[PDB]
Amino acid sequence: QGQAAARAAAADLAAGQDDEPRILEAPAPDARRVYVNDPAHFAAVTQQFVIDGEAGRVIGMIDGGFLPNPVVADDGSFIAHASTVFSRIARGERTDYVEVFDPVTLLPTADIELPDAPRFLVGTYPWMTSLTPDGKTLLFYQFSPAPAVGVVDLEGKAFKRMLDVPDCYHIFPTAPDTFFMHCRDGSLAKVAFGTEGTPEITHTEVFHPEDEFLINHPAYSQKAGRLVWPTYTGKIHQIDLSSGDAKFLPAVEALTEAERADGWRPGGWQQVAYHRALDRIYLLVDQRDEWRHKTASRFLVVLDAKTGERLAKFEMGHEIDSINVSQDEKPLLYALSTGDKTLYIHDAESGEELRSVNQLGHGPQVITTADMG
Amino acid sequence: APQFFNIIDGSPLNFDDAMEEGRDTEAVKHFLETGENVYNEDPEILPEAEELYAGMCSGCHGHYAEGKIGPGLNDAYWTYPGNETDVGLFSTLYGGATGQMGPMWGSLTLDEMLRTMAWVRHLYTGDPKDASWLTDEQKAGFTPFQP
């Protein structure tokens, strides 16, 4: 950091060495690489910070347009985003596009135009643009004029087509040609395409009543076929898609009865994270009125995903808005405070804060990690 | 109001046109004196009611009276306000509305009309609050219809 590169810099000089400037390359992608996206409160141009969560060092950055959807391949071979730019800053002719970037040089690999500006401009929901698990196709949601998901071939670098879908939202791909959506009615729809006319679409049953409200940020581990989906109360629905079909596991309660009696509820942005190897759930929680669900929260609960057994409750100390975890054996709990524009990196085991990376744009809100291998 | 008038207009409904073939029942007597239809939610009735509906009504209103050529009959908005009640729903069927929704006394006995009403009432997807046509015990076992 400073001190380190100063005694370095200084002594470089007392040893005589003069500087021949160059453009650096980012260290090869590892499991400790963490991506922070700053939507910047709906500003027309945004930034994504590439951080090495271990050393707590920003190691690169990427620029984007209005309200983009970041995507990271789990195996670390690229990162991409779907983005929107305008000829005169915030007005003029719209261009929606996907850009693909190499993850060592940060240089763009493909730039693919999406016709007729079809992206959905929403506060950022990680599962509204998704990679299929082979990494050759990107799917993104269109809300108006009618629900649809577009298919981008990242391999021959082209937009393929739009798929008519029912009144369903979020895209959870389970195979090269299949993904699930959660519908208005309370069901999940399975969409199989490559069925080159219209896709083949199937509903599961309704799994939550009309008055149970599931959040906009579900956690999905694609390598485990596992969807962890909280509700405003911290009841956690879990669906397993590893067979190809939706199997509804048992709903665990994330808050103790005494916490719900004392008014604890989940609140934040990316409120949940799921570690797949340890099979655990982390939830952001605090005491709040019923309808103060988007506010930051000061605790973190950890529970066993199978049993609902509460493993730990961390006292974070800052106001956190989003969490996520690295997917390795001894993981970090990434806690992002939009108000501090700072990323606190804690030990996921103990909840002990280890590092922080501050000055992370104007409104950072989304953390993305790759589940590597 | 006193009871039965044509809902758009010729006002008094005329019961001398009804078939005698079914005006005899306890249901029709009870309803004509009180405006209350005993077939609502009657598990006994409901399988005939569903077939009366499919033969005569699904063409225009759809299978679950969710709407097709003509309007949905399954929620709390009624183009004619009276239809929140069985007296008014009855008056729409006996008397007719406009268009292709004509008077139904020449195809249905009075007791068949109240059986079809109860299927319409069963197809409701709102909640027991505006289910004013139901008594408390009928509300207490009423479930919003799911296709």
Partner: protein
């Protein structure tokens, strides 16, 4: 173009003509989702609830351009007169799960 817009602003419900072809919008839906009318008829939608709703035909349905109609608020109306025959599909701009169709024969 296949529809003339008669009043381009919503006007009030209690001014809809005596016995007009009417689609009510209530309980988040278009209560007569498949209207049939003849070449020359005017359809009026009327929004019976507080939640503002509109009618929106996309490009290539009524004309070269999409017609996003004006938002109606409670008890307001909005008409369209279909001059060619055909099935015209529409949805509600803020709420695209709300759909309907006019069939002009």
């Amino acid at each position: 173009d296949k529809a003339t817009i008669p009043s381009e602003s919503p006007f009030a419900a209690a001014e809809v003509a005596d016995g007009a072809i009417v689609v009510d919008i209530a309980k988040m839906k278009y209560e007569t989702p498949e209207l049939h009318v003849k070449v020359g008829d005017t359809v009026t939608w009327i929004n019976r609830e507080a939640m503002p709703h509109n009618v929106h035909f996309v490009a290539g349905v009524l004309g070269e351009a999409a017609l996003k109609g004006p938002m109606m608020k409670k008890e307001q109306a909005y008409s369209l007169t279909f001059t060619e025959a055909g099935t015209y599909d529409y949805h509600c701009t803020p709420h695209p799960f709300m759909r309907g169709k006019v069939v002009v024969e």
